[PDB]
């Protein structure tokens, strides 16, 4: 029922609009993957697609008997598709002529990958501006540039971006100036003034 469509290259854009703000907010993370203001599962082996694993940025689409809608987005790097867990909850994804089955995910970290282990090892350097590759439903892909702030958790810190986009943009990748994916958009908190702030969702 769900499929992926390639829609952009993974790149830094020199003309991106600069927006957002660099906040600092105290949060805790629950075992369902929700942040509040203040583990990993290896999936079944296919066992016996061939989906398309071309590098790039992708929309996650779904449909029933009528038109389609955009459930989310993600990134294909080194033959593995990466998204937030909550976009698909582990559902299989068609990719071109074949199927991609989940490999590994964590509800609490809100991360899921298909085709192999997580390939994205780069992280925000804690200093520089970053770019979100915005995969908004119904719209062409564009990049926006921002300086992250920080979620302060009881154990540590996580980079966080004050950028609000509509439902279905979750899983859009965030890149550093080299064009390396430093994490994904779409799991955060709402502030008392209504501002939405997402973690830069990434492994170690
Ligand atoms: B995303 C969507 C992108 C941001 C939309 N903007 C906004 N809500 N103002 N992300 C969210 O809405 C997430 C969803 C989510 C789902 C599941 C988990 C793990 N249990 C965590 C987050 N919501 C928030 O981050 C949120 C936190 C606190 C209060 C309100 C909202 O695009 C496709 C999918 C839709 O679920 O996500």
Contact (CB, 8 A) for 172 and 141: no
Alpha helices in 72-158 (DSSP H): 85-88
Solving technique: X-ray
Question: Where in the sequence is the domain holding 31, given as residue range(s)?
Answer: 11-38+122-204
Write down the catalytic residue from 82, 86, 122, 127.
Answer: 86
Residue with the smallest CA separation from ligand 1 atom 12 is 167
Contact (CB, 8 A) for 110 and 85: yes
* Quoted resolution (Å): 1.5
Shared-domain flag, residues 90 and 5: yes
Enumerate the β-bridge partners of residue 124. none
Structure tokens at 92: 């299989």
Cα(43)–Cα(59) distance, rounded to whole angstroms?
A: 22
Cα(94)–Cα(1) distance, rounded to whole angstroms?
A: 8
- Domain containing 92 — which CATH number? 2.40.10.120
Cα(159)–Cα(183) distance, rounded to whole angstroms?
A: 10
Nearest to 158, CA basis, from 178, 138, 184: 184
Contact (CB, 8 A) for 81 and 72: no
Torsion angle, alpha carbons of 1, 86, 146, 8, to 10: -20
Q: Which atom of ligand 1 is nearest to the CA of 71?
A: 33
Ligand 1 center–CA 97 separation, angstroms? 30
Residue with the smallest CA separation from ligand 1 atom 27 is 189
In order of 90, 114, 197, the CA distances from 42 in angstroms are 11, 11, 30
Give the count of domains, the chain: 2
Q: Are strands 173-175 and 130-134 parallel, antiparallel or unpaired?
A: antiparallel
Helix (H, G, I), strand (E, B) or coil at 172: coil
């Amino acid at each position: 029922d769900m499929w992926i469509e390639r829609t952009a290259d993974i790149t830094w854009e020199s003309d991106a609009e600069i927006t957002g703000s660099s906040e600092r907010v105290d949060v805790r993370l629950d075992d369902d993957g929700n942040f509040q203001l203040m583990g990993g599962v290896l999936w079944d082996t296919p066992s016996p697609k061939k989906g398309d694993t071309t590098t790039g940025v992708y929309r996650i689409m779904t449909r029933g008997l009528l038109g389609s809608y955009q459930a989310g987005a993600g990134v294909m790097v080194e033959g593995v598709f990466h998204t937030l867990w909550h976009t698909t909850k582990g559902a299989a994804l068609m990719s071109g002529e074949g199927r991609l089955d989940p490999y590994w995910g964590s509800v609490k970290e809100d991360r899921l990958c298909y085709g192999g282990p997580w390939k994205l090892q780069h992280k925000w350097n804690g200093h520089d501006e970053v770019q979100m590759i915005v995969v908004e439903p119904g719209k062409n892909v564009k990049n926006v540039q921002t300086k992250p702030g920080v979620f302060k958790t009881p154990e540590g810190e996580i980079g966080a971006v004050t950028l609000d986009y509509p439902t279905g943009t979750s899983g859009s990748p965030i890149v550093d100036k080299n064009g390396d994916v430093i994490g994904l958009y779409g799991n955060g908190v709402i502030m008392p003034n209504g501002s939405y702030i997402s973690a830069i969702v990434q492994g170690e």
